[PDB]
Scaffold this active site. Structure first.
Site, mmCIF file in Angstrom:
data_model
loop_
_atom_site.group_PDB
_atom_site.id
_atom_site.type_symbol
_atom_site.label_atom_id
_atom_site.label_comp_id
_atom_site.label_asym_id
_atom_site.label_seq_id
_atom_site.Cartn_x
_atom_site.Cartn_y
_atom_site.Cartn_z
ATOM 1 N N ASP C 26 -29.630 51.111 14.713
ATOM 2 C CA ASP C 26 -28.266 50.832 15.195
ATOM 3 C C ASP C 26 -27.705 49.712 14.331
ATOM 4 O OD1 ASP C 26 -25.937 50.258 16.682
ATOM 5 O OD2 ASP C 26 -26.953 49.505 18.454
ATOM 6 N N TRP C 51 -36.771 45.270 17.075
ATOM 7 C CA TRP C 51 -37.239 46.431 17.801
ATOM 8 C C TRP C 51 -38.157 47.274 16.891
ATOM 9 C CZ3 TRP C 51 -31.949 45.768 16.365
ATOM 10 C CH2 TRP C 51 -31.429 46.752 15.553
ATOM 11 N N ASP C 70 -33.172 42.994 11.511
ATOM 12 C CA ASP C 70 -31.808 42.768 11.056
ATOM 13 C C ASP C 70 -31.786 41.697 9.978
ATOM 14 O OD1 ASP C 70 -30.791 44.559 12.970
ATOM 15 O OD2 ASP C 70 -30.438 43.026 14.456
ATOM 16 N N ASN C 98 -32.446 49.224 21.035
ATOM 17 C CA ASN C 98 -31.636 48.914 19.859
ATOM 18 C C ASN C 98 -30.139 48.640 20.160
ATOM 19 O OD1 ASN C 98 -30.346 51.404 19.848
ATOM 20 N ND2 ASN C 98 -31.448 52.215 18.039
ATOM 21 N N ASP C 99 -29.794 48.450 21.442
ATOM 22 C CA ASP C 99 -28.412 48.070 21.821
ATOM 23 C C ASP C 99 -28.266 46.559 21.969
ATOM 24 O OD1 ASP C 99 -27.803 50.781 21.935
ATOM 25 O OD2 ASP C 99 -27.913 50.898 24.086
ATOM 26 N N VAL C 100 -29.249 45.796 21.464
ATOM 27 C CA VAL C 100 -29.147 44.348 21.386
ATOM 28 C C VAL C 100 -29.211 43.878 19.937
ATOM 29 C CG1 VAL C 100 -30.058 43.916 23.715
ATOM 30 C CG2 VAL C 100 -31.669 44.084 21.762
#
EC number: 1.4.9.2
Lengths: 110, 361, 122, 360
Positions: C26, C51, C70, C98-100
């Protein structure tokens, strides 16, 4: 018609029309503050055929509205005629200079 | 097997690099510089520049200078106007230099954020809205003081034949020259005669800059000149960019950083459009015209690709043009420019592109 | 073993959301942002946390453990945005999620880009 | 002569207002809330929310709360995580409440930033990356409690039948209930039995929330329930959303804030798509399915318009859906939703829309 870049009063607007941003032609959207200074435009009224002075105050202290962007340049001049120039932020002297939107304020004839 | 690392340098050599100043007007608090390789269109990195950043590269090619505005809480809190010094190869922040809270907030004309020929001073436009020119001492990391003599004037045109002199365009239609001392304060100054009529033939501020003269184009397609080879600036003009046929179709200049000079040949490059009238001076280019400034004749015209701003490289004989989002690369080693490639999507809202300097001593 | 070594592969293949190892990504691929699959773009910093998950490599038929780090401390790259979700799970399985922002514990948490680091055979 | 003035209030009544949380992911440091009138699509104003802002409106309708992160120089300098209180009618900043520098940075699921039913405490998710729940006392303007008991859990589901209680979903597949005292400190807690198998049938975190129970859907289209009519939460499930025809075409749920409940009828709304398999749990809706939670059967299905998130207004019987950029307004006073209008370009990158509260 007032939310269109072709509305006669908007002849030297560079920015987002406040009337599309929750304000009106002469009121800032809630929570944004008028600039005490402005560039000034001379726009032709297509109804009475007379020329009017329009003061282009920005509204300030919120991030970009993003709606109804205009870039009209009738009688606009460069920064050596500073108060006819619209490629600067007329919020530049506000408590918060972040640019939100631009109004089109009718001063009177001329 | 693998480990993600940082600390890396830009992958392409300096001589391949260009800087696209993305205002991101829709989200102007997240303006940034995009670094591209002009030889193949590759994206190489970026420098964040907060609200309405301006950018230039140090004359010696080692550092990127930015100018921007912070507030403690973005839309509220104390204002900090700054110049930042960034390492060009690592694209990392090094130093912040504090400015008074009146640096120009506006579109990215070259002349709002410049440096002396010797590279020792950064020279920037202030507006409070009263105008003055700000001087930053690069060695000291200090703001020197306002050039108050420049009230009622606008923009900075360095004189490439002197180490720490520049000019600015004034409301009386003339030029003010400022000569700085070794400390960055005004050592002397002079004012030219009227070059252009502000009322009848206003000029674009963007110079076509030679080593000892500058040319300027007007809203009506005239050309004016300021010669600073001598002690004092001598001004002349107009001469017209236009022939009868041009005039008949109302061709006039338009754009932002809309001219350029190829110094070795004296060719001046100008964005033009037909059907000119009051209010069209920022229209995209229908064409690029190439003028011989010696003979005062047009030597080429090519499609404009809706360009608004340009820049010239004297060392590789190149012109970049920029339509707001896309960068066109031209070979200008001959009178007719040749289009090499277009870099699509280089920016969302850019009106300025610049080369990484090569040579130039 | 080209399928394991993105620097030897075709850029167009590696910069695609369909590349086999980018299976729970993401964000903007760092390899499109002036970095590579295993190097942050200049002036951005790797996340020390991430993640994780496994991805199938169709080229050699094996399954690999991936760490989705990241790069941080610069504003959004904007290029090659992916949103793949193979075996991704919600925040009550936090390190599969993966939404953080996996830059959340960096010195500067501004999200720049993301990538897929090959750890080993699953 | 005209004069430009400030200090104005939002031009439409509170009851017309919706809040579209625009992450602006391409420029995530300039996220904001856009305020619209759902009755006519008019843009009413906005609230800036810096890096990855989250938003909610106070339950009494008077204030807007935001949660965000600042740094002294955006990409460098000291971090400040905050809640801000804004006036709802003037859209002006009033107060900053300091948080510890671990507020969740992530997509705008409702459950990351909530409030107690009585409105006296803001309840928010932290991740450092260790998880905990933070409690902010609105009256005092202070961060007053850090619920470490919630480690390994995620998201906040308020109980609408108690003044200061909420649940969170834990790594054991059960729920942890927290009951706050009037000081905002934990007054008691409890843990349910396992509700779902984390490994075999993971649930979406978004609740379909009733006054005294909540329903959750799973990656494979099952439904689980948590009944909190008593102090101890009772859990059950699964029942399947799917009949045999549905299963043959591999229908499963997908989205973000992907469910809703119409409390008067017990209808649950769910975004669904066919050809489900591993990795499709965030796909846009092909359809919205309308389920009777009492009979455990579907009653209606309509086109999903590629929606990803929804919200429900109980008292006007409305459902909003959101595809990332556009907001659809539906009348849900009857079992089949009716599309009333679409508001185009409400955001660039939004996964959350909310009504102004009218229920007090």
């Amino acid at each position: 018609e007032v939310n269109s870049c072709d509305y006669w009063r908007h002849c030297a607007v560079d920015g987002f029309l406040c009337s599309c941003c929750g304000g009106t032609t002469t009121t800032c959207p809630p929570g944004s503050t008028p600039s005490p200074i402005s560039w000034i435009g001379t726009c032709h009224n297509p109804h009475d055929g007379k020329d009017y002075l329009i003061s282009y105050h920005d509204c300030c202290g919120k991030t970009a509205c993003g709606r109804c962007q205009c870039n009209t340049q009738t009688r606009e001049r460069p920064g050596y005629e500073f108060f006819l120039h619209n490629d600067v932020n007329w919020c530049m002297a506000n408590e918060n200079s972040t640019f939100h939107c631009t109004t089109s304020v009718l001063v009177g004839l001329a | 097997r693998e480990v993600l690392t940082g600390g890396h340098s830009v992958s392409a050599p300096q001589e391949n690099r260009i800087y696209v100043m993305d205002s991101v007007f829709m989200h102007l608090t997240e303006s940034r510089v995009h670094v591209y390789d002009y030889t193949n269109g590759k994206f190489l990195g970026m420098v964040p520049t907060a609200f309405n950043g301006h950018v230039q590269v140090s004359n010696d090619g080692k550092k990127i200078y930015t100018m921007t505005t912070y507030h403690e809480r973005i839309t509220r809190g104390k204002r900090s106007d700054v110049v930042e010094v960034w390492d060009a190869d690592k694209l990392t922040f090094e130093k912040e230099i504090s400015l008074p809270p009146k640096r120009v907030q506006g579109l990215n004309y070259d002349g709002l954020f410049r440096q002396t020929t010797d590279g020792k001073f950064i020279v920037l436009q202030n507006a409070s809205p009263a105008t003055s020119i700000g001087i930053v001492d690069v060695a000291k990391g200090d703001y020197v003081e306002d050039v108050t003599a420049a009230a009622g004037c606008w923009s900075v045109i360095p004189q490439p034949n002197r180490p720490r002199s520049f000019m600015t365009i004034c409301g009386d239609g003339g030029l003010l020259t400022i000569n700085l001392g070794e400390d960055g304060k005004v050592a002397s100054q002079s004012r030219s005669k009227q070059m252009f009529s502000v009322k009848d033939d206003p000029i674009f501020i963007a110079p076509a800059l030679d080593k000892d003269k500058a040319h300027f184009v007007s809203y009506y397609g005239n050309v004016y000149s300021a010669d600073f080879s001598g002690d004092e600036v001598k001004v002349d003009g107009p001469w017209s960019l236009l022939n009868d046929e041009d005039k008949a179709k109302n061709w006039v200049p338009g754009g932002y950083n809309l001219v350029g000079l190829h110094r070795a040949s004296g060719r001046m490059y100008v964005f033009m459009h037909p059907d000119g009238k009051e209010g069209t001076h920022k229209f995209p280019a229908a064409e690029i015209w190439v003028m011989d400034t010696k003979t005062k004749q047009r030597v080429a015209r090519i499609p404009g690709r809706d360009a608004l701003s340009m820049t010239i490289d004297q060392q590789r004989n190149l012109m970049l043009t920029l339509d707001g989002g896309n960068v066109n690369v031209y070979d200008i080693s001959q009178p007719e420019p040749k289009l090499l490639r277009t870099i699509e999507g280089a920016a969302e809202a850019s009106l300025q592109v610049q080369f990484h300097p090569v040579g130039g001593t």
